Amino acid sequence: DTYQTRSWLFTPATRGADVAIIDLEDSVSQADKEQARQKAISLPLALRINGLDTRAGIEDIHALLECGSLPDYLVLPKTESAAHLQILDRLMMFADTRLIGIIESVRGLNAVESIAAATPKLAGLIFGAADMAADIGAASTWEPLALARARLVSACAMNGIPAIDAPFFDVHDVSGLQSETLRASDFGFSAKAAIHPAQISTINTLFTPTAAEIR
Amino acid sequence: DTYQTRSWLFTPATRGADVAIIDLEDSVSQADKEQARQKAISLPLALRINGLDTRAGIEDIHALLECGSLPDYLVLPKTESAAHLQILDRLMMFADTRLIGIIESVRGLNAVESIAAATPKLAGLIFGAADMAADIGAASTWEPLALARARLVSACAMNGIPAIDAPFFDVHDVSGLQSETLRASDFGFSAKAAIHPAQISTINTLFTPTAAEIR
């Protein structure tokens, strides 16, 4: 069940989080796509493939469908429409695998309601702050992205799926990590991505209900 | 005129605000619905009936249409579509009664534009912060709900009706009540609901222009 997860940790395919995400995309160079790919083909496991509109992502999907083996969660970058998810859904249906979409673009953000409602196999949406800000021409800070975040959480809640917050960049700014994570929880995010295991415990704790609440 | 009104005070049907709202809903227990109903049936007056999608609300509406007597304002909880308001409007076509809708759900919020335009009898919308927060999975604090609030004020303003802010929970935090009320006024709320008479003078004062402003 996707709602229980609190921490999603990105580690590149080349080489305690609640979910590990094997990454084929932005951490992986263009030259490394085939090597990271087949490595990955070899506790719930996620795989972020390259975008459907990339040759890398077509290759990734082809390899997945051939060598048989699939993660519990397929993470699709630059999810921009419900058709993005429905294509994956139909593709994965031949050969129990659930989808996670990333909302990292304006186009994606404008269609977020229909994206969140696209298919039962969708298990959550990740906010992509850095690309969202870059697409808009904004700073990565909270305030310019606050609209986007609130709109994302609402679409998730409307469809009974968790909103997963963007990763926090500064591994060294534990204060900043604590503040942003708390802000996301108050907004209604159920989880937050991460790019370093040092962030995990902070993230786990803050997205964990209190004994008072559990009662 | 609804725009002049500043304070809306909820008092349960069982038993100086500009409008009093006799409540059949959340303050009244389920066992108490019949008592409160007929007692309520017994300066402008509002009645909040139970939701249209509840057996309680059907009975309330049945009793209203039967025993003849109607308030100046009919307050509908959990307004989620234009049809909600139009059904009441047609039901009220036999037997001068105006409607107030409550936006307390994501579904309501997403349809807020069409709701604000639903019928001429609609005289205003109340924000239901606590249920909205719960529906989203967010905290009741200002920030997670600012989008929801801004979207509500805008749809109201477009249809020439006042936006009425949620009641403030903490009766003891007068500071918090002043701050939120001022925030709501700045946003374009023209009025605010209340759950205790101690809040009334504060709400009235803060929504009353100053001699400085009038000059």
Add this chain to the structure above:
Amino acid sequence: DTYQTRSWLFTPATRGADVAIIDLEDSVSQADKEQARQKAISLPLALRINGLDTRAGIEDIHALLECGSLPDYLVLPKTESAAHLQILDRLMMFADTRLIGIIESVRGLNAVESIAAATPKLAGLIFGAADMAADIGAASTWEPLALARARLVSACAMNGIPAIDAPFFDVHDVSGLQSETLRASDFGFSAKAAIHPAQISTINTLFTPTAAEIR
């Protein structure tokens, strides 16, 4: 290229910014519209005509189409639909002139996605904070308008055009001007309007890239 511009200065027809806007509208009295009109008919130049839904604006357009001469930028107030811009576009297809729409109303804001996509001739959108706040019944301050600004910037970014921030009212509050300009920049605005030449250097400087960026 509109993206290069940082400062847009409104000056009434009656009487170093990157673009000067000769203004026929709110700075010009109604008695002065004919007067102001014909002077203007006699470094890139912008012209804000009166609204299409005003007798003044029809006359302004008539005068423009007759005496042959057109500004580099035609600035249209109260842009409320895609048709607003398309009408102007077709009117000036005979006699290189690009359009700038002003989003200053709730109706304009709700249609901002379709306005920003209306025609290739559209080169940017200006936020009209003072009319937007008044239309909503809100204060002119940042917070009540933050949702509106984020929605405007998003629509611009999606269509490959710059968002231009509203002018800051207080000429004497240089601190407020600096703060608003930075917030706008962070939000993803590429430029900001001005209503007095004293504001120009501040706006220019703050929208000028640092050596770190340039590298």
